[PDB]
Amino acid sequence: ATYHLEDNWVGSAFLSTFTHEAIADPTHGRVNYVDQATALAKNLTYASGDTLILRADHTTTLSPSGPGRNSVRIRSIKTYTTHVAVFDVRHMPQGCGTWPAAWETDEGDWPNGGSVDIIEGVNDQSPNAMTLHTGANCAMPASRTMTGHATNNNCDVNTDGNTGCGVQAPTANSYGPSFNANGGGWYAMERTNSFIKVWFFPRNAGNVPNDIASGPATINTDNWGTPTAFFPNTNCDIGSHFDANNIIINLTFCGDWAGQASIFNGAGCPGSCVDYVNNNPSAFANAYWDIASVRVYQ
């Protein structure tokens, strides 16, 4: 469980080690994903000093017949198999309609190269969800050692209604306005051939491993306590369902999950998701990631 520093991304480093994907939203959201040149001119991406900002447009009222709300989706140039990824996150997007994620995938053969969500939710609904999506023959035992709570235990996208196999973080400050109020915190994900684990440490935690908080060149996950989410290989050959994955950090709106009326409305958001996102730009002034660092160890 000992790893050594492979990549250390801070501020402007993200501009040369990740790309912006100006792509049609694969989850069909009310979003216009812009390229890196456009992101920078329009200040949707700001990457300077010890800060990366990734945000949505919070000034434009959308044309109902035009493209969605301007936002960004960044993807690491490098891919990883057995590794630990540590995200020091000060702020994540909030707002009705928002659907932010920090995750890993191989887009080129989805779902067969797998996907793991480290940070994800919709419509400001805490807590955080940590979820795997795979092809066939991957499930999770009903009970295993973690602080979080499992919801769906079948990871196979074709037989699970695309929910994946997920775990809910135990605290509200894992996600959303609550996370943001607390100054964020740290997410760490360890992936091996045998398992995937995610740990969350709130910004104010008295027990955050120095490994995680200070980012030295050597880490040891044995010292990190029980994971928030645990995906063992009891009923899933982990290595055979995941290949080399890029890291992706993005913000979409509405679409296949967040945009469902029951979900959007069930979260206390008014009206329809698309109309809300069209007509309330100032409601997304806080729809930003503020990232202090992402580090990868191998």
Ligand X SMILES: *[C@@H]1O[C@H](CO)[C@@H](O[C@@H]2O[C@H](CO)[C@@H](O[C@@H]3O[C@H](CO[C@H]4O[C@H](CO[C@H]5O[C@H](CO)[C@@H](O)[C@H](O)[C@@H]5O[C@H]5O[C@H](CO)[C@@H](O)[C@H](O)[C@@H]5O)[C@@H](O)[C@H](O[C@H]5O[C@H](CO)[C@@H](O)[C@H](O)[C@@H]5O)[C@@H]4O)[C@@H](O)[C@H](O)[C@@H]3O)[C@H](O)[C@H]2NC(C)=O)[C@H](O)[C@H]1NC(C)=O
Ligand Y SMILES: OC[C@H]1O[C@@H](O[C@@H]2[C@@H](O)[C@H](O[C@@H]3[C@@H](O)[C@H](O[C@@H]4[C@@H](O)[C@H](O[C@@H]5[C@@H](O)[C@H](O[C@@H]6[C@@H](O)[C@H](O[C@@H]7[C@@H](O)[C@@H](O)O[C@H](CO)[C@H]7O)O[C@H](CO)[C@H]6O)O[C@H](CO)[C@H]5O)O[C@H](CO)[C@H]4O)O[C@H](CO)[C@H]3O)O[C@H](CO)[C@H]2O)[C@H](O)[C@@H](O)[C@@H]1O
Residues of this chain, 1-40, that bind ligand X according to CB under 6 A:
11
Strand 69-71 and strand 31-33: pairing? parallel
Minimum distance of ligand X from residue 13's CB (angstroms):
12
Q: Is 108 in the site for ligand Y (CB under 6 A)?
A: no
- Going from the C-alpha of 151 to that of each of 110, 124, 174, 226, 278, the distances in angstroms are 22, 19, 16, 18, 32
Q: Is 103 in the site for ligand Y (CB under 6 A)?
A: yes
Minimum distance of ligand X from residue 39's CB (angstroms):
11
Minimum distance of ligand Y from residue 204's CB (angstroms):
27
Q: Quick one: 49 or 66, whose CB is closer to ligand X?
A: 49
What would the two tokens of residue 113 be?
Answer: 């190269």
What would the two tokens of residue 112 be?
Answer: 């067969």
Q: Is 56 in the site for ligand Y (CB under 6 A)?
A: no
The residue length of the chain stands at 298
Q: Is 286 in the site for ligand X (CB under 6 A)?
A: no
Q: From the list ligand X, ligand Y, none, pick the one residue 66 interacts with, judged by a Cβ distance below 5 to 8 Å according to partner type.
A: none
| Contact region with ligand Y (CB under 6 A), list: 32-40, 43-51, 159-167, 216-224 | 159-167
Give all strands (DSSP E) within 64-153, no chain letters. Answer: 69-71, 73-76, 83-91, 98-105, 115-120, 129-133, 138-139, 149-150
Q: Is 115 in the site for ligand Y (CB under 6 A)?
A: yes
- Going from the C-alpha of 181 to that of each of 21, 184, 198, 250, 294, the distances in angstroms are 30, 8, 22, 21, 21
| Contact region with ligand Y (CB under 6 A), list: 114-122, 183-191, 197-205, 290-298 | 114-122
Q: Is 64 in the site for ligand Y (CB under 6 A)?
A: no
Q: From the list ligand Y, ligand X, none, pick the one residue 64 interacts with, judged by a Cβ distance below 5 to 8 Å according to partner type.
A: none
Alpha-carbon distance of 66 to 84, in angstroms, equals: 40
Q: Is 242 in the site for ligand Y (CB under 6 A)?
A: no
CB 126 within 8 A of CB 174: yes
CB 97 within 8 A of CB 282: no
Residues of this chain, 29-88, that bind ligand X according to CB under 6 A:
43, 46, 48-51, 53
Helix, strand, coil % in the chain, rounded to nearest 5: 20, 35, 45
Q: Is 237 in the site for ligand X (CB under 6 A)?
A: no
* Residues of this chain that bind ligand Y (CB under 6 A): 26-27, 101, 103, 105, 107, 110, 115, 117, 120, 129, 131, 133, 161-164, 166, 256-257
Site of interaction with ligand X (CB under 6 A): 11, 43, 46, 48-51, 53, 90
